[PDB]
Structures are given as C-alpha cells and as structure tokens.
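[Automated response] Your request has been received and processed.

Submitted sequence:
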Amino acid sequence: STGSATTTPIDSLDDAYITPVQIGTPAQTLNLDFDTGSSDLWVFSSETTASEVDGQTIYTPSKSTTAKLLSGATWSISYGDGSSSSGDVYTDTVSVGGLTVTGQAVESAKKVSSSFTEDSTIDGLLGLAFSTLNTVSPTQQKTFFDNAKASLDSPVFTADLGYHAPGTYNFGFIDTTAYTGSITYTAVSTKQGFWEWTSTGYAVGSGTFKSTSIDGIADTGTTLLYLPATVVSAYWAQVSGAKSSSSVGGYVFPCSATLPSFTFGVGSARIVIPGDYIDFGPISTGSSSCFGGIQSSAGIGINIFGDVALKAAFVVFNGATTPTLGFASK
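Generated structure:
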C-alpha cells in the first residue's frame, strides 16, 4: 500500500504545517502537525478541558464505532519549545492520504499547554520519530508509520515541504518526479529515538564550503534551523545590521538587508537553502527588525534541521531494518 497527503503551512511564515488525518468511523478529519521529532499521535478531543480548547477541531471517541479505550493507558509529553499535553488513549482507525492503519493508538488530550490552545490551526500532532520515544504508559505504543510499515510497498515516508506553499507527505513510495538530480543517503543513529544524522559541513552564500561534522536531527516539527553558535555567527556576520538579541530570543536583522543562502552538506552532496527561506518577518507588527530562521542550538543539547532546512530538500525517511535518511535538491 501507499498514502499521499498534502501538507499546508499554518500561516504566511511557514511556522508549521498541517496535514489532514481521518480518525474513526465515520471519519473525523483533524489537521495534525506531522512531527519527525516526536512519537505520539495526540489530538484535541471531547475530553480536553473546555477552557483549553479555542477553535480546534476535536476527536470525539464516543462517536466512532471503531474506537476502543486502551484501558489503563495514559500519556504525557513535553516538547523542546516548552509546550506540553497529556491524557488517556484510544485505539481507532487512522487514515492518511488513503493509507489506513487499524488499531492505531490515538492519544486523547485531557490537558494541553497554552501555546496549543492559542494555535487554532493545529488539532494535534502525529509523531514520526522512532516508537521508542512514545510516552504511553504502561504499554508504549507504535507510531502511525511503524504500524503501517509492513503493509507499505517500501518501508519509507517522504517529506516535501513547501516554501510559503503546500507540500506533500508520501508513505510507501518515492515520487521520482518530485526532486532533481539524485537522492544522497546518509547514516542514521536511532540511539536517542530521532532521525539523527551527521551533516558534512556548510557554506554561507557564495562562500567556500567548510568541511566539518555537524550531528543533528531531521525534525519536521521544528520551524527553524538550529546549529552550533560558531556556524550561526558565521552566517549572520554576512548580514548587514544583524545581531543576537537576548530580549527577542535570537538573531534579528533589518528587513532592508539581503539574506545570503545557506548550504549544508549531505555526504558529498549539497542542499542550498535560499536566503528568502531564512526570513521570519517582523519581531512584532510594524517593526523594522526581522526574526532570523537560522538560530543557535546552544542550550538545546542537539542541533535541529527543522523546516527551514528540510523545505529546501526532498527528504526520504527510510525505515528499513537499518534506517537511513535521503536528501535531494528540488
């Protein structure tokens, strides 16, 4: 089998992407944030504290003839951006772009933190990291991809995120029309539960390529590109007027400035992030100071190839017995 679904930016800045997911019988369609940096599929629901729901579409298990309580199961998660959610668990039928998993753990939120409540466009998350990170207790649950894997034509999914435009998540096949050149594959470590890999270096604009190993994760659930402070400093030094602002919480720059591209290495291959992808707009409405899309990972404890980086590529998440990542230009 295969599946194919369009993913759509939630706002004009590509702060995140939402993909429609069918849950239950009859289908309840929720718009979920596909997140290769976590491993829980959780939803706003009829069980979510009322004061914490503000415009989201909810899953109501009692209206699904295929929903079954996963008795005794609870979940609780905290994300790198400080947000969190928790609740109980049902199993139900979940379909993405034509691909159906029966018995998928659907984690129903009883509580969500403020940032979730405040984002009316995201109805939940669908985790696509390794199932070892899943937070369900006492019995850890499998991701949608893990459950689908054996049925897929090939044990892969692909992320093709758009710049200020929709893109595509495919399951079970590689769309050879969706990228240019070849796909370069690179090794993955699953030891921390992430799609963790090692970039071979970087370049800033037309500058010479610096060969240096940068370990990081391919994370569709993180908006920006977070890299070591040395790398980030080298980038912003090429932007007139750029500075690191402690009050804003990262590098900012005047929008009158032109942003250089940023290149990252995948083996001997190179992915070029255009300058425009690194502009995240005014720090506040009407400000002439713009927020940068490349930021320091110092204090995160890991480098993160988030949407800024991934949307410049066609990305293969290869879930073969030995997982790997593939990157192509597009």
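Summary generated for your ticket: The first helix runs from residue 114 to 117. The first strand starts at residue 3 and ends at 9.
If you did not submit this request, please reply to this message.
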